[PDB]
Amino acid sequence: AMNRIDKTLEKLKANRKKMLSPYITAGDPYPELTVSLMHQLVKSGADVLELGIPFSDPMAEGPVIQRAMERALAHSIHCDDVLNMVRQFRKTDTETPVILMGYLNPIEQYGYDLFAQQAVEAGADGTILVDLPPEEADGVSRVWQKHGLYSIYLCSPTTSAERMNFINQHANGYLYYVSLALKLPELKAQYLQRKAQSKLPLMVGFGIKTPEMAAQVAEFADGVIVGAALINEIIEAYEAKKDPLQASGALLSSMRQAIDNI
């Protein structure tokens, strides 16, 4: 089988088009908006969608994501609810790759094989498990492989030689680059250095707040991941009693254009 992620990245690579991937938390600010948001993001230029599974103990996330998860958990949105959203999305979008981002604990509670099976059946193409270090990922990788689910791994300026060895023979699709006062030339230097160690394309997954910054990064990077900025744009629209679809659409579309004109 050919994974949606590989199909999408091949087309982008052939056209010298940089990947743009928004993150949103499923269920935030309320469950009925999530699928509509997903479709809006695609309309506004998303190549890949990152959909977050809310978790009760996100000690690793920044304040913006933390609050998003709290809002989603107020509606009791869990793994099965997120898969139902993916199913609904897939009714009118079969091309766009969907990546599920979450913590390991709800999934292990759910059951690895059962989760992988249902996630693939629902129409998800891969997962980012934020608290699963590569050293611990062997059981998961084998189960994911069985169902054709892709594992998206994180790396950083300080990813060790052996960990990189762990990432290269189990990762598929692409890698997620994060640095943790970091400036653009340092980011560029460290990114290109890490990219040289990776078999896969490397997407920058932090610090992208504006169309300008998105373009500056896309100038050297394979792709860009936008999280906190979009979440903030959406919840600010909701709290101001304005259309969150308009707000998120305008933001992502301005990033799409900035990147493509860069």
Curated annotation (Swiss-Prot):
It comes from the Bacteria. Pathway: Amino-acid biosynthesis; L-tryptophan biosynthesis; L-tryptophan from chorismate: step 5/5. Gene3D superfamilies: Aldolase class I. Keywords: Amino-acid biosynthesis, Aromatic amino acid biosynthesis, Lyase, Tryptophan biosynthesis. Pfam families: Trp_syntA. InterPro entries: Aldolase_TIM, RibuloseP-bd_barrel, Trp_synthase_alpha_AS, Trp_synthase_suA. PROSITE patterns: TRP_SYNTHASE_ALPHA. PANTHER family: TRYPTOPHAN SYNTHASE ALPHA CHAIN, CHLOROPLASTIC, TRYPTOPHAN SYNTHASE, ALPHA CHAIN. NCBIfam families: trpA. The alpha subunit is responsible for the aldol cleavage of indoleglycerol phosphate to indole and glyceraldehyde 3-phosphate. This is Tryptophan synthase alpha chain. It comes from Legionella pneumophila (strain Paris). The gene is trpA.
